[PDB]
Design a protein around this ligand. Structure first.
Ligand SMILES: Nc1ncnc2c1ncn2[C@@H]1O[C@H](CN(CCCNc2ccccn2)CC[C@H](N)C(=O)O)[C@@H](O)[C@H]1O
Ligand SMILES: Nc1ncnc2c1ncn2[C@@H]1O[C@H](CN(CCCNc2ccccn2)CC[C@H](N)C(=O)O)[C@@H](O)[C@H]1O
Lengths: 342, 342
C-alpha cells in the first residue's frame, strides 16, 4: 500500500505500538483545549453532521466519532491501525452506539469502506503540523470523499518567525561543548566536537516561550486540505522575508500552527500559537548553529524546505540571510528526534 | 547469526539507532560511578592488561579501550554494532592509537577476530542487569577467549528485596481512574478502567527510593561470567525466601545489581544498590497486583522467573506468598517497556 511504500517497517511498528497504549490516549484527552475545541467545532456545526456519513481517520479512543454521533451523524466509519481499535470498540458498545459507529481496524490506505462519505474528520497534526506524516493519510482518505464533501479540519496555517533566546542557545551549545575536552579520564574527545554540535543542533526544540522573544511578525503558509494531494506533502517549500522589528541576534526560527474547521454555521479555529493557551503541540524552535545579527528595519530572507523521509518525519533545511549585510546561515534539522524541553 | 535468530529485526533497528547518538554516550560518560569504577578496575589491575590482547565488546565511544591502552595493552579489538563505531575510529586516530586499537564495526556474533584474546572487557549491564540481553553477547564473545583468560566484569549479582510504598501503589489506581468517568465530554469511559489498570501494572518502575522502604535483606542471584553459557540467560529462575525485618504491607519487589572486576591485584566492585550513590541504572521496582501483609519474622517466599523474548528483553513473572498465613500474590511485567518515574 501507499503507507508501506513510504514507511520503513521498524518506524511503523514503533509508531503504532506507541499509540496502542491507554496512558498515551489519557495524556492526549487531557489536552482540554484540543478536545474542547474539536467538540465545539463539530457540535456547533451540527448541520454538517446531521444524518450524514462520516469517516474518522485514525480514531484512536474514538472520541471524535462520539462527537460526530452527538451532532446527529447517521453513520460513522472509524478507521484505526493500532490496537487502540479494540478499546474503541469497547467504548462504542458501552455507550450504546453500535448502530452509529463502525470501527474498522487497519490503515486508511489499506482498508475497504462500503460507501463514500459526506465528511472526513481527523486529528492528523504532529509537531510543526507535519511531523508523523499523518496529513498524507488524511489526504489519501479523500478517495472516499463524495464530490463537495467537507474536511475537518479544513485548512492549516503554519506560522514562522525569527526569535532571540540566548539562554536556549547557550544551553544547547554548552551541552555540545562537553566534547571539547582534551583529557576526559585521560582521553582527548575534541575531534568529535563538531559531530556533537551537529547532533545537538539538528534537534528541534519543543516547548513554549514568551512572544517577547520574536523579532518580526510571523510569515504564514497555508495548506488547504480540501485541495491538496498527498504528493504535495513530500516536499514543502516555504519562502520567507521578515522585516525586523528589533535589533539583536537571531538564534533561529519559531514554528506554530493553526487549523480551521470551516463549517456551514461558523468557522472554529484551533491554535497552537504562543499568544494562545498552551496545547500538547507546544511550539517548535529550530536553532541556528551560528546566530545572525540584524538591525531593526533589516530584512531576513530565505527558505525553509521540508523533505519527507521514510521514518514518518521530515528533514528540515533552513537557509536564511540578512540582506543588508550578506550574513548567511544554513541549517539541517531532524524533526524525528526533537528535544522536549518542557 | 546467533544475534539475528534471538532478535526481531525491528527491535534491533531501534536499539542500535538509540546507541548511535553522541548524547547518549555523553550521558553515560557523565555517570562518574560507572566511568571512574571501570577506569579504576582496569588501571589498578595493570598486570592483567600489560602487553596483553584485549577484546572490548560493544565499545561504544571507545572509552574502555582507552583505559586498556592506559594500562599497557599490546592490542585491543573494539567491536561495535551501531554508527558509534565511526566516531570510535575518529577517537582512535586523534589519540594516536591506530597501531594498538582496532575498531571493528558490526555485531560480535557476526564479525571475525584475527586472534584469541587474554581478557574481555565490556559494559553489558542493562536495567535489572539483564535488560537489553547484552550479557548474552558478552558470553558469546568467550569463543575468542584463551584458556584461563579473564572477563571484566567477572561476576554479576542481582539483588531482590521486598518493599512497601503505599503512594506508588495508589498512583496506579489514581492514574487509571481517569477512565472512571460517566461523561467525559458526553462519553462514558468507564469500561476501560480495568484495562488501564492492567496496563500500568505490567510496567516495572525505574527510579530510586529511600532504603527505609525495604522490608528484608536482599536475596542474591549470581551469574559467574567466566563459567556461564549464553543459554543460561534464556530462562532465569530466582527463588527467594525473605525473612521479614519489619511488619507491614508488601507492595512488590525491588531490584538492583552489583558487578565485580576480579583482577590479579584486587577486586573492584561497581554497585547500583540504593545504599550507594545513584547511577544511570537507578533501581527497578515491580509491583504485586495485591499487597501482602507480613509480620516481622515471617517468611515471604516465591519465584521471580525471567523469560527472554525477541524484543531484547524479558517477560517477568513474580509469584510470592506469606508462608505463615497463606496469602498469595503474583504479577506479570514486560521489562522492555519500563515506566521512568525519576
Ligand atoms: N494510516 C493510519 N491509518 C489509521 N490510523 C492511523 C494512521 N496513522 C495514524 N493513525 C492513528 O491515528 C491516531 C492518531 N491520533 C492523533 C495523534 C496526534 N498527535 C500529536 C498531538 C499532540 C502533540 C503531538 N502529536 C488520533 C487522535 C484521535 N482522534 C483520538 O482522539 O485519539 C493514532 O491512534 C494513530 O495510530
Ligand atoms: N551484539 C553487539 N555487537 C556489537 N556491539 C553491541 C552489541 N550489543 C550492544 N552493542 C553495543 O554495546 C554498547 C553498549 N554500551 C553500554 C550501554 C548500556 N548502558 C545502560 C545504562 C543504563 C541503562 C541502560 N543501559 C557500551 C558502553 C561502552 N563501554 C562505552 O564506553 O561507551 C552500544 O554502543 C551498543 O550498540
Amino acid at each position: 500500500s501507499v503507507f508501506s511504500e513510504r514507511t520503513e517497517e521498524s518506524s511503523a511498528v514503533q509508531y503504532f505500538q506507541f499509540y496502542g497504549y491507554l496512558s498515551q490516549q489519557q495524556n492526549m484527552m487531557q489536552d482540554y483545549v484540543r478536545t474542547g475545541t474539536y467538540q465545539r467545532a463539530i457540535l456547533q456545526n451540527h448541520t454538517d453532521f446531521k444524518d450524514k456519513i462520516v469517516l474518522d481517520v485514525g480514531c484512536g479512543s474514538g472520541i471524535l466519532s462520539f462527537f460526530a454521533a452527538q451532532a446527529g451523524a447517521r453513520k460513522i466509519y472509524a478507521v484505526e491501525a493500532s490496537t487502540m481499535a479494540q478499546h474503541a470498540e469497547v467504548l462504542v458498545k458501552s455507550n450504546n452506539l453500535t448502530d452509529r459507529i463502525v470501527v474498522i481496524p487497519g490503515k486508511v490506505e489499506e482498508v475497504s469502506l462500503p460507501e463514500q462519505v459526506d465528511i472526513i474528520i481527523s486529528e492528523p497534526m504532529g509537531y510543526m503540523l507535519f511531523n508523523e506524516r499523518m496529513l498524507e493519510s488524511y489526504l489519501h482518505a479523500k478517495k472516499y470523499l463524495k464530490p463537495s464533501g467537507n474536511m475537518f479540519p479544513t485548512i492549516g496555517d503554519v506560522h514562522l518567525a525569527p526569535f532571540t533566546d540566548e539562554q536556549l542557545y547557550m544551553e544547547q551549545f554548552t551541552k555540545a561543548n562537553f566534547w571539547y575536552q582534551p583529557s576526559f579520564h585521560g582521553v582527548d574527545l575534541s575531534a568529535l566536537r563538531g559531530a556533537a554540535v551537529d547532533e545537538y543542533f539538528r534537534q528541534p526544540v519543543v516547548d513554549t516561550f514568551d512572544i517577547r522573544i520574536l523579532m518580526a511578525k510571523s510569515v504564514k503558509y497555508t495548506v488547504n486540505f480540501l485541495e491538496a494531494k498527498e504528493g504535495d506533502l513530500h516536499r514543502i517549500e516555504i519562502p520567507f522575508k521578515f522585516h525586523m522589528l528589533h535589533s539583536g541576534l537571531v538564534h533561529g526560527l519559531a514554528f506554530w500552527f493553526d487549523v480551521a474547521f470551516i463549517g456551514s454555521i461558523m468557522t472554529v479555529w484551533l491554535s497552537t500559537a504562543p499568544t494562545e493557551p498552551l496545547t500538547h503541540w507546544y511550539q517548535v524552535r529550530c536553532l541556528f548553529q551560528s546566530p545572525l545579527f540584524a538591525k531593526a528595519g533589516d530584512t531576513l530572507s530565505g527558505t525553509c524546505l521540508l523533505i519527507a523521509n521514510k521514518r514518518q518525519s521530515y528533514d528540515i533545511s533552513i537557509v536564511a540571510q540578512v540582506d543588508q549585510t550578506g550574513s548567511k546561515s544554513s541549517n539541517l534539522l531532524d524533526l524525528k528526534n526533537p528535544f522536549f524541553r518542557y
